[PDB]
């Protein structure tokens, strides 16, 4: 029942909110990748959950863009654009808990 919920949640947001959300997620994915190698116990299931969550987000993004009427080429140009302007920020998830500590 989580899938349906999450999708309803997704389809109701704005574009900037989606972007931001995506970034935060990718970062958490990073920190997760760190834990794997640290051999600190964690949940295998988490990679799947997160990665796929990101998938769903991007899907929705592109799907709206299609209604706007934009092509594949325009898509990929605006994509290079957005991946250029990406700056890393520390994941709010587990890095902010080592900024506070």
């Amino acid at each position: 029942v989580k899938k349906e919920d999450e999708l309803k949640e997704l389809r109701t947001k704005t574009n900037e909110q989606l972007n931001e959300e995506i970034l935060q997620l990718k970062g958490e994915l990073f920190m997760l990748r760190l834990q794997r190698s640290a051999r600190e116990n964690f949940k295998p299931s988490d990679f799947g959950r997160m990665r796929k969550r990101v998938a769903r987000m991007l899907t929705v993004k592109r799907e709206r863009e299609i209604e706007q009427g934009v092509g594949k080429r325009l898509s990929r140009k605006l994509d290079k654009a957005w991946k250029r302007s990406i700056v890393v920020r520390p994941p709010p998830s587990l890095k902010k808990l080592q900024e506070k500590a």
């Binding site: 990718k26 920020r89 520390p90």
Partner: protein, 96 residues
């Protein structure tokens, strides 16, 4: 003049793949205050410096890349003298 294009188009969150933990690296940490990170082959030094400078919030002196015979980039990140290595070692879960 224009926007500064990064050498390639990558997605920064995938470039630092992981710390390499073996007997070798740990004493590099001890001596040189330098972390050891397997990174994406397609990834450069300027991208690694921004990535780690922002991510763990440390100023980094110098980065040295490498390419294994297996085609996996490996990066020595030697931090400044101010920020200790072993700090980030306990922060990440690498135990010297």
């Amino acid at each position: 003049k224009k926007l500064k294009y990064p050498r390639r188009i990558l997605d920064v969150y995938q470039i630092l793949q992981s710390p390499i933990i073996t007997e070798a690296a740990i004493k590099n940490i001890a001596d040189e205050n330098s972390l050891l990170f397997t990174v994406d082959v397609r990834a450069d030094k300027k991208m690694i410096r921004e990535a780690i400078s922002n991510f763990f919030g440390v100023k980094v002196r110098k980065v040295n890349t490498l390419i294994r015979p297996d085609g996996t980039k490996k990066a020595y990140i030697m931090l400044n003298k101010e920020y200790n290595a072993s700090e980030l070692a306990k922060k990440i879960g690498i135990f010297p």
